[PDB]
Design a binder for these strands. Structure first.
Ligand SMILES: COc1cc(NS(C)(=O)=O)ccc1Nc1c2ccccc2nc2ccccc12
Ligand SMILES: COc1cc(NS(C)(=O)=O)ccc1Nc1c2ccccc2nc2ccccc12
Ligand SMILES: [Mg+2]
Ligand SMILES: [Mg+2]
Ligand SMILES: [Mg+2]
Lengths: 779, 779
DNA sequence: GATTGGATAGCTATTCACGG
DNA sequence: CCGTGAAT
DNA sequence: AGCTATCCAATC
């Protein structure tokens, strides 16, 4: 309860006081600082007429918790959920404002009973603040007291996130959306004399800006208004039907026309339907993009940033670092503008490894406590006391280093960030476990057998496999010719397919001579403590058992169960036996069903729904093949340029004494003399280690050349051994060049043998990691 | 209430159950992993007879919170105050153990009533856990129930601190103290095949390691035993007399002899007196070292680390950074092995600036809110939302950049860290405000007037000042000839010296047409809120006042005292008007006394006590003088070496076409022919950038070198323009060399004029900072 | 009791889907 | 009712 | 994102 009352709140001047609701604590501090500006300006808000309160992060969604029931007289009353009534934030809001769940406030006399004139929401300009928190608050108010919105009881504090200043002019130009900002920027010829400022939340606007904004306080308050359509909109974005969200979120967001925003800014009334259509839709699309993995990479945006930052950090030396320090480094270098605790949790999850864990091939090696098979991995240590390091042996084979220069990249404010997506050697999307929800769709994936995947890919790329010709299709690409069965690496149970569903069964053994029943393997991905709690809550099963206990150490589980005398007969009697599941498995809940929700995010943004793992594999193959071809082409261009440069270098070295470079005056004279002598001008910085640059860029930049590759020659290279090593290197480049030229004309596509070798290397690395419990050089 | 009771604990097997008291959740996880072993370690501890509890706090010193009173029955009883009774950790411990404060437990019958047979402390091996926590626990038990310590009711878990593994062997060796490991390693012939591992606490250990520890569990439990001496020793370390700690902590810790440690490791019993004399004394000495400033530098260890880290970080660019990110950088790069919140608080305190603050000259510019005169500076923002940057001008003028290469340094694991101490141009120890306690001592300093300090230093250095001669002493250097008065920069009150004490007075005015009392200034360093609460607390003062009001701005003080009508008379009558302070000041408490406790830390460890600021200045002067001399000599030597190198380089570049280096085969042939031609062999890397080498190191490593400075020359240098620039550089270096030679011979000591120029520069920087409210290029 | 600095770490609730 | 990851 | 208590000393 962070309420800071107003002096006139609840008194005879209640109908002109204001209540400020802050998204978090930074907004609280900014509001307090602005309010405590008395005696410097008689005009402006102050604590005698304004309130102060905090919402505390995400607020609850009332539209799902409430349930509508009709009465005898046809009245429809909304019963509020037990959890809904016990929420502290909503209770505090309703107590401070003195709202009633029975009065409809249809008349001004009823509106006079509230303790404040109006409620003003102060939230950040980011997607989360404007779309989720404000949207949820609007949904709450619309659901319970729709009439309040009509009479302008709900207002918001609109603050820009972009400010462009021009030196010599004291007033800036403010943009509330990036679209209008960049449209204005591209409209102008040059902004080199200007300066742009972003505001990631209300943790900005230095005291000068705070004073300037609070001077014109009334110019920032915007009143929400209601229309007819908004009703059916509020049900779509916050109702209990996810099908409507699926249909709504399958398309993009249409921005507001100029007339609409002109009316909004001239009158300062915002229709809630427009707010839902723009801000909430944008937030939901961003949430989909953040919480659902890409079908090529298999990882979400946060995990991709983590991997890129880890590669950058541990490229120098693979030394352990604290999770907090590494997360801070990642947030600093990868431009992660969210809370650090979420990043640390994501790192910890990515580094975990145990039977049944989400990652079969984690990209990190964890030093410390990183969860266990029991407790579902939630028993991990704090990020301040555990360390992670790069599993370089597996990474350098799964994500080839030379292919990183060719992926499309994500640019923030003109700076490079983590790539848009990686293209692994083997399809990682269908090679690991995962399960989590998002807006509209849910994602769930059970890993496939490694041997089946290897056989399929080797058939596709081998050109010598007896099944290669039929894997390629001259009829259609829906037929299945090879099995893709669920993996059972760390699983001692069984997997059986019935109809269209795969079921996993744990294994047990029964010693009737003593009346003891012991289970030795639980089904796939079930925590032991959760399983024990589940088997204890069922009183029907609990009746037969005297006691159950465990002696599982850290990775192998066994439960021993002593049940009441002469209970087995009743066990078979009450619990039916079927070919899908026997009496004992039904009794002990040793059967699990593997449901798959193959919903991913396509490279160009958006969602995509698959029907089988074969579709994912067939979609992933062309990207990898094209990446191989592009890599080879750029490699050939680089070799040609490098050969030309090295031949010129050797030619200069041969006759360096004759030239007598010391005789000439300066750089330009020497360059002119060299050009007169026939030395070609190249781009040394673009050829010795080019860039993320592409091939046409390579040619264009190599067109304009300098003579720096001669002037930067150390005297040590002028000896004889250096020249001999240089010509040997030239021979090696020539051999590599004609080898890759031969590789280019290869069937079925260029670089098939390279793919085969990478497959073998990654298979060996995976085997080595499995042998040492995924702790390389630590066994 | 973290507590997992043992199965047998409660009164049936209470005599064999043991309770493990740990530090944090890391120890909890380690102990849980050890105890959960089953069917793989049958002879080992388990939850049948092992307790589990977390302290979850810090232990209060009970010896200071109790009162001993003798009743009429000739019995001395100890009554505990409210805070001791209400402490959560002690209450939990006494409830779990079921201790009685009336039973003396002198026999086995009363001891059997306890819920556990023994209590085992499981703390880290660092100074904190071993010293502070264990000493406080032992003090608690000895104060209340000595017989429990006598009968071995208290034990500790002794875990190895450092372990070295022999490659090819599965058994390492263990050391519990750093000195033992250091002695063994120095005595050991070679350790290339040996792998050392530090265990900072027990949060980091191998699974096989903990498996072995719980395989041999009783080998790591040591019982504490009492003796005759300890009865008084506790009173020295935890009693109410600080003089005993002053007399005890003024010397180093005497290590345990070989016979004592051999007996301890043989019988597994530890005398409590030895533990107090070693671990607690070491911890207290470390606390003194890290909580009291150095009299030369003027800052503590944490502040020195912060300053060095800021200098290293903001060198590339002065762009602002968030406080938490900068703290993470400092912790990473200078090996800060403590919590991040402490570092963030220290940085915030170092960057603060307001009237009456502790830092008249902050080493940081703070963007955001950093507190104000009211609330004493505790109203600053969160470290995640306020930015800091380096005050480049003041730092560069106060701590010269070159001198940083010549200070003694602190080494961690063979790597450099923050300097041992800094030697600023002006003595910063007596130009700031400070007040804080530490073990056995208190530090309190009131800043001196800048003008007096400048005059004193100049008279000591100018050699032309008419006061220079008698400032030096041919009779005795324990006399004062110049004033040293408290500074009044942001002070509009009065300062008056009476006897041996300075007093600060506020300023007040009176108006008789209402009898309005207006306070325009408070004494030095008193927050407004605390003063208001103090004036309200005393009944006899505000009983004559109805109201008090204050419209105080961010930097101004005004208090209006709405007091009773016709009241002045008994204010004069009651509150006595003395020559030291008038009745009105006595009635508003506007007089303060400036007490100074000048206790500092010597450069080579230890504490030192001064009697006046003149002593501090006199001690500080020779260090700066010697540093100036050493800097001048090192620069002279470096200049000579660089002149030789550049002359040789010029000669080569001049006659390079003659030798025709292309003819020779490899590096050795080129070196041989160069030596034959007479080019001297030097250490190019050292002379180009020594950065830490002493004056003798330059000479010793000059002759042993290579011919790298020739073979690393590029073609661009062979041109005429490069040679002309080189010869111009040679001329400039010669001019600087003979200028330095002139500076070397200079009365009274070398480099006096340099000191004068730097004094003028720092004075100008200070004035510029004062004029812009210590916000450079931000006004 | 209060007050100053530099050190000790672990809790506080939700949103989004779709099956148990 | 619970439970997953990524966010306030 | 914030919120939770104590140790040292000497004067108030
Ligand atoms: C409802 O969200 C919060 C409420 C409170 N206090 S209350 C009204 O329930 O008595 C405090 C914090 C939060 N929000 C939380 C977070 C917000 C931002 C970032 C991390 C957060 N982590 C939280 C963890 C547990 C509970 C609330 C958190
Ligand atoms: C659980 O919190 C604490 C645990 C300990 N454990 S131990 C054996 O090292 O003494 C010690 C102290 C705390 N409490 C802490 C705080 C309590 C109140 C207010 C602020 C606190 N700040 C802390 C900062 C770091 C560590 C513990 C703190
Ligand atoms: Mg935000
Ligand atoms: Mg510790
Ligand atoms: Mg910690």
């Amino acid at each position: 309860d962070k309420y800071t009352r107003a002096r006139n709140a609840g008194g005879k001047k209640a109908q002109d006081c204001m209540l400020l609701a802050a998204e978090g604590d930074s907004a609280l501090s900014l509001l307090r600082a602005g309010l405590t500006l008395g005696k410097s300006n008689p005009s402006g808000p102050s604590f005698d007429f304004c309130g102060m309160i905090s919402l505390g992060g995400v607020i609850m969604n009332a539209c799902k918790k409430v349930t509508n029931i009709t009465t005898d007289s046809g009245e429809t009353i909304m019963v509020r959920n037990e959890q809904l009534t016990n929420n502290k934030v909503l209770q505090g809001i309703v107590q401070v404002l003195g709202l009633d769940f029975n009065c409809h406030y249809k008349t001004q006399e009823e509106r006079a009973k509230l303790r404040y004139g109006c409620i003003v929401a102060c939230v950040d300009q980011d997607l989360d603040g404007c779309g989720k928190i404000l949207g949820l608050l609007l949904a709450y108010f619309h659901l319970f007291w729709p009439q309040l919105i009509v009479h302008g009881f709900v207002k918001r504090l609109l603050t820009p996130l972009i400010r462009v200043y021009e030196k010599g002019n004291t007033v800036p130009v403010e943009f509330y959306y990036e679209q209008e900002f960049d449209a204005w920027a591209k409209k102008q010829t040059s902004l080199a004399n200007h300066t742009v400022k972003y505001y990631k939340g209300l943790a900005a606007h230095d005291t000068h800006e705070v004073k300037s904004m609070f001077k014109h306080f009334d110019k920032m308050v915007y009143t929400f208004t209601l229309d007819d359509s908004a009703k059916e909109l509020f049900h779509i974005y916050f109702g209990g039907e996810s099908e409507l969200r699926k249909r709504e979120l399958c398309t993009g967001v249409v921005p507001l026309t100029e007339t609409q925003t002109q009316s909004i800014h001239s009158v300062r009334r915002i229709p809630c339907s427009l707010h839902l259509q723009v801000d909430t839709k944008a937030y939901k699309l961003d949430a989909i993009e953040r919480q659902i993995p890409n079908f090529l990479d298999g990882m979400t945006r946060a995990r991709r940033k983590i991997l890129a930052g880890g590669l950058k950090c541990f490229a120098s030396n693979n030394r352990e670092r604290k999770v907090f320090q590494f997360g801070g480094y990642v947030a600093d270098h990868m431009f992660y503008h969210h809370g650090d605790m979420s990043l640390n949790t994501s790192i910890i999850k990515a580094a975990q490894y145990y039977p049944g864990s989400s990652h079969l091939y984690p990209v990190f090696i964890g030093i410390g406590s990183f969860g266990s098979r029991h407790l579902g991995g939630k028993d991990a240590g704090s990020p301040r006391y555990i360390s992670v390091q790069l599993a370089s042996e597996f990474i350098k084979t799964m994500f080839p280093t030379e292919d990183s220069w060719l992926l499309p990249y994500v640019f923030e404010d003109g700076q490079r960030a983590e790539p848009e997506y990686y293209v692994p050697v083997l399809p990682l999307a269908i090679m690991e476990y995962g399960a989590n929800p998002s807006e509209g769709w849910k994602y769930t994936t059970w890993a496939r057998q490694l041997e089946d995947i290897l056989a399929l890919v080797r058939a596709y790329v081998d050109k010598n496999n007896p099944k290669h010709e039929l894997l390629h299709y001259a009829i259609d690409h829906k037929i299945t010719v090879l099995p893709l069965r669920p993996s059972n690496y760390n699983f001692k149970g069984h997997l059986k397919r019935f109809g269209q569903y795969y079921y996993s069964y744990g294994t047990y053994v029964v010693s009737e001579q003593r009346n003891m029943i012991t289970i030795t393997e639980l089904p796939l991905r079930v925590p032991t403590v959760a399983y024990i709690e589940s088997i204890k809550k069922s009183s029907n099963r609990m009746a037969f058992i005297e006691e159950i206990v465990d002696y599982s150490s850290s990775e192998t589980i066994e439960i021993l169960v002593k049940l009441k005398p002469n209970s087995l007969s009743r066990i078979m009697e009450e619990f039916k036996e079927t070919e899908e599941q026997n009496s004992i498995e039904n009794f002990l809940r040793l059967r699990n069903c593997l449901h798959s929700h193959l919903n991913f995010v396509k490279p160009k943004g958006g969602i995509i729904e698959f029907n089988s793992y074969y579709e994912i594999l067939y979609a992933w193959l062309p990207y990898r093949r094209d990446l191989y071809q592009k890599r080879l082409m750029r490699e050939r261009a680089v070799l040609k340029l490098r050969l030309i440069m090295e031949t010129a270098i050797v030619r200069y070295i041969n006759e360096s004494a004759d030239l007598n470079l010391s005789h000439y005056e300066d750089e330009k004279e020497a360059g002119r003399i060299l050009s007169e002598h026939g030395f070609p001008p190249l781009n040394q910085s673009l050829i010795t280690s080019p860039e993320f640059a592409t091939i046409e860029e390579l040619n264009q930049k190599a067109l304009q050349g300098c003579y720096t590759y001669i002037l930067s020659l150390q005297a040590r290279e002028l000896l004889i051994a250096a020249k001999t090593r240089r010509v040997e290197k030239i021979k090696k480049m020539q051999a590599r060049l004609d080898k890759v030229e031969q590789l280019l004309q290869e069937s079925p596509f260029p670089g098939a043998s390279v793919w085969l070798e990478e497959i073998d290397a990654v298979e060996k690395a995976i085997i080595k990691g499995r042998n040492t419990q995924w702790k390389f050089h630590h066994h």
